[PDB]
Design a protein around this ligand. Sequence first.
Ligand SMILES: NC(=O)c1ccc[n+]([C@@H]2O[C@H](COP(=O)([O-])OP(=O)(O)OC[C@H]3O[C@@H](n4cnc5c(N)ncnc54)[C@H](O)[C@@H]3O)[C@@H](O)[C@H]2O)c1
Ligand SMILES: NC(=O)c1ccc[n+]([C@@H]2O[C@H](COP(=O)([O-])OP(=O)(O)OC[C@H]3O[C@@H](n4cnc5c(N)ncnc54)[C@H](O)[C@@H]3O)[C@@H](O)[C@H]2O)c1
Ligand SMILES: NC(=O)c1ccc[n+]([C@@H]2O[C@H](COP(=O)([O-])OP(=O)(O)OC[C@H]3O[C@@H](n4cnc5c(N)ncnc54)[C@H](O)[C@@H]3O)[C@@H](O)[C@H]2O)c1
Ligand SMILES: NC(=O)c1ccc[n+]([C@@H]2O[C@H](COP(=O)([O-])OP(=O)(O)OC[C@H]3O[C@@H](n4cnc5c(N)ncnc54)[C@H](O)[C@@H]3O)[C@@H](O)[C@H]2O)c1
Ligand SMILES: [Mg+2]
Ligand SMILES: [Mg+2]
Lengths: 253, 255, 246, 260
Amino acid sequence: MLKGKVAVVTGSTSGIGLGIATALAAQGADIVLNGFGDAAEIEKVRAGLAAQHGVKVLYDGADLSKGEAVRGLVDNAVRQMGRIDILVNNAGIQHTALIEDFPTEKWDAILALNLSAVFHGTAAALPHMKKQGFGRIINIASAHGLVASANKSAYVAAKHGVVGFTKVTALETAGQGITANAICPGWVRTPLVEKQISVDQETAARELLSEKQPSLQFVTPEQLGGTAVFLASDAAAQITGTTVSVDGGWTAR
Amino acid sequence: MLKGKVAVVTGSTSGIGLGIATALAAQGADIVLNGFGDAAEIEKVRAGLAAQHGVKVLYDGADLSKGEAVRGLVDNAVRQMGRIDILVNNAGIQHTALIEDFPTEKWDAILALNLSAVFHGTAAALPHMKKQGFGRIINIASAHGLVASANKSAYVAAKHGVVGFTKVTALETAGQGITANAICPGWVRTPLVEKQISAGVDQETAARELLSEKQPSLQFVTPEQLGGTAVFLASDAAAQITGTTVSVDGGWTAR
Amino acid sequence: MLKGKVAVVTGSTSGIGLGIATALAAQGADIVLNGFGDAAEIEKVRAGLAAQHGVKVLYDGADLSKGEAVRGLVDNAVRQMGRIDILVNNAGIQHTALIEDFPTEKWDAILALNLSAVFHGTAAALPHMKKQGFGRIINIASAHGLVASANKSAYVAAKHGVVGFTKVTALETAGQGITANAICPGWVRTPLVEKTAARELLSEKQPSLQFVTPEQLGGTAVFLASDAAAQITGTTVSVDGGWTAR
Amino acid sequence: MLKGKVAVVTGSTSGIGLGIATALAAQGADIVLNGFGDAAEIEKVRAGLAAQHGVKVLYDGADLSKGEAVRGLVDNAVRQMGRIDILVNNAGIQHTALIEDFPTEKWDAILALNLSAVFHGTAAALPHMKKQGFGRIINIASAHGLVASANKSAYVAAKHGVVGFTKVTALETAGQGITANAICPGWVRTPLVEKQISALAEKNGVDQETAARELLSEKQPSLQFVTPEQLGGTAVFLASDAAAQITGTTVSVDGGWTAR
Ligand SMILES: NC(=O)c1ccc[n+]([C@@H]2O[C@H](COP(=O)([O-])OP(=O)(O)OC[C@H]3O[C@@H](n4cnc5c(N)ncnc54)[C@H](O)[C@@H]3O)[C@@H](O)[C@H]2O)c1
Ligand SMILES: NC(=O)c1ccc[n+]([C@@H]2O[C@H](COP(=O)([O-])OP(=O)(O)OC[C@H]3O[C@@H](n4cnc5c(N)ncnc54)[C@H](O)[C@@H]3O)[C@@H](O)[C@H]2O)c1
Ligand SMILES: NC(=O)c1ccc[n+]([C@@H]2O[C@H](COP(=O)([O-])OP(=O)(O)OC[C@H]3O[C@@H](n4cnc5c(N)ncnc54)[C@H](O)[C@@H]3O)[C@@H](O)[C@H]2O)c1
Ligand SMILES: NC(=O)c1ccc[n+]([C@@H]2O[C@H](COP(=O)([O-])OP(=O)(O)OC[C@H]3O[C@@H](n4cnc5c(N)ncnc54)[C@H](O)[C@@H]3O)[C@@H](O)[C@H]2O)c1
Ligand SMILES: [Mg+2]
Ligand SMILES: [Mg+2]
């Protein structure tokens, strides 16, 4: 369990990030949620987690394009919650086009959120974790941090960058009670994906998965949350600077 | 938890394998132990796990250097325990020598136990797992299944072979309720390593010096950590983790 | 032999990019040098290479830290040479500091040069290559595109990003007569590195205890540009004396 | 070029090993051929290469499933040729089946030849190379030494073992003028692959060229086969001085297979 610990999860107002925050809450950690969305819907989620799990849950809507807003998210977590034990760098965006057709605005944006936000968040958290003599940094990368797909140049470059950044973090913290690892999911069934799915649908789901994901099954936010729980546990104290692939066999082949 | 499930752990009479068996028993799994040592101590271990955790624990002394014995261990497990949910292929041996000096008998011994026994155990377990709609194969490889050290050609070859074999097992079973993964530990503080650490400064100073070459954390991995890693791969959160390696190595493979 | 082909080598005024341009010049490709330094001491080079190997050798001083300058270099290299056959993305900078001590400006500068310049060059080069039906993108990454060292976060991240970017470039051009690959060097005795103790510096990372040389890297680029390397695409070639083997 | 140098290429009577042996002979290297097939055709090959390239070419038909025979091939190459500069460990066999259906005899045969022959060959070569202060060991692994495919358990395990073995070899010889690397090809349209094209051809009840494009499509984004000449060219590169600090690594020649 993680009673007495505080976890910040970026981009946790929905999807994977919310699944992770929810799993960490269920182990007793206080939580900082982050992301965009409807004010009322977010408050429902925040109040609901706090009441269901008996922990404190803050919401900080910091826009993570801006490195100063990222470092301020972390510093505010420490101000409001007392400490920061676990940082999950999860927020991300996508844009598909050929390299030649790839808008520079999208390239820049993808790197800023998907990579540089990891740097800024991690830079802000480390001094606290080192003083504590305890930390877990869990970066949510992708199968695309290890291998590539056509038409995803910026996202693949950024995720790969996250993997290498994760390894450096780990080497700079080795033996100080801090680990840093990257979870690399394959396909997770988010509403964005759900659109693409629409001769019936569970024949369409299987067909969409079959190119990359041999199990023909989606990964779930709940499974990624249990993977983050595991990495946050004492059993994972010597797991550092590595990747945990949660991808249905995508990287096996 | 793993109540009602059955785990066979090869090489579990001591060390990493016993750590894994223990962690699995503590989640409620029935256990088949295996390996060598003193038979009185083995029975003490077996009885004590069963009493402490309220699970059924068997011992099967199969010599895993023999393919038909590995297969019989798995078949005996199913016969006696009723099913097989988790197979941990852990038993392993080592020899250090330059390649040109490496005895053929040692090459062949290391391949037979560290690699071929994973093939034989997997082959026997898979039909049962596919019929159950559930299985977890957990192969204990090493950092030396991903990277090399000088003078360890047979161990490195076999552990690499285990990593690749793990991937194929995952691809043959993908979607069938079965996963196969390889845990890749760095240094764990066994009696053997202790003897090296024994070999002018303080004990814990020599420990850090010895870890220094390969393990950035300068902290040993423990059998309990590796047991909790096996518990996690056996859990439902790990249902889509298949055909991959989980490195428990203090930063060894990050650099 | 590469006669009738044009190579752009970014960062070719010194160290490995020059090493590579020279090696490629020695095979009959026309060269576009690029980089910083004395306008005249570079003329010595642009002149001495063109005379030594009997090829056209341009110079473009484009600051690659700007995305539009990269795409200009490429488009101008086409205009001044007629075509582009080989793009070598080599220009790169370093900075060593703990992550929490790492200046954001240095972070952004490493990412703009070491990574985004590679995206920019490739975006500019690709339409010409796809029409040519022939291309060689060779990105000069590092051992640090595959593994990490402490205190080098922006560089390791950029270099991992290049490796990943190379793979996508390969996948988008597959079967179109274009390949993209990354050479991942270990230690090279540059000016910066040069400043015995030479075996002990290599000792931590590079088991051969021998430096990699620009001519070696030049040979490696020449190979990837060859017909034998036609189905070598989307991959890394480590020239690192054993660094990544352990 | 390799004038004055001796290369041993296992499994060089056909397919990839033949392309590699030819490219090395074309650089001035003396060649020991090895492998099976039709003996008249093998002699035509051996005499042909010797004459065409003006180098010495021998055939040793050692069965490399036996470790003594592998060491014997290397020993006698040094006896008969004067030295050994290049060892290309290339011979291999394939068998497909589900793991639970995979005959123990086929598992053993694929480990013996595809992995243990690399150990025996390297072990016999190294003392000579270390003495000479020069050597190139080039192991022909596969994309399957880095990633898997279903139904190829023994072959994927053996190829992965070759990749790890190659790394240890590099580390043991680092700095001594010896490098050890593994070329990792994707599909090459040899008879090893033809049997597979034919099996896919019959499964889907389709022609042979449907099967080829589809075989390629599953794995190899270029949709073009790799050729023995390309692999020969890659081996010549690794044997060169340009590759002096390329050691303990893999070179994928796979049309994008491992990029995705
Ligand atoms: N969904 C998949 O199939 C998949 C697969 C592999 C990896 N991932 C990765 O997992 C992570 C989570 O994404 P997801 O799939 O749940 O998407 P999602 O849209 O469901 O959630 C993304 C979250 O990030 C937040 N966000 C976006 N921009 C932000 C900004 N500038 N500042 C603060 N928050 C911001 C959103 O508000 C939201 O809470 C991403 O890094 C993604 O790339 C997703
Ligand atoms: N110890 C480490 O630092 C380390 C690191 C990485 C991986 N590993 C791996 O972990 C696994 C177990 O190692 P350990 O360090 O706990 O070793 P250990 O010697 O303590 O245990 C090995 C087990 O295998 C059993 N065994 C050996 N040969 C057998 C055979 N012929 N038939 C049946 N059982 C046999 C032994 O009786 C023992 O129970 C091995 O595969 C090893 O390669 C160990
Ligand atoms: N030297 C090594 O030990 C080593 C090892 C691995 C990889 N590398 C990589 O190889 C590449 C070349 O490095 P090097 O060691 O030859 O360095 P170098 O200093 O010798 O040369 C770098 C070149 O890039 C140019 N350059 C710098 N900033 C530029 C900019 N903004 N716009 C255009 N040109 C610019 C310089 O003028 C110079 O010509 C780099 O990407 C580096 O990361 C170097
Ligand atoms: N064809 C491909 O797509 C492919 C792809 C990747 C890797 N490879 C590898 O390339 C190597 C060569 O394969 P190939 O496709 O050229 O096949 P091939 O069947 O054309 O050649 C195999 C060669 O090995 C020889 N050989 C077989 N058993 C032997 C033994 N016991 N002793 C000595 N020689 C023996 C054969 O006689 C022949 O000379 C193999 O290691 C294979 O695994 C092939
Ligand atoms: Mg390494
Ligand atoms: Mg892959």
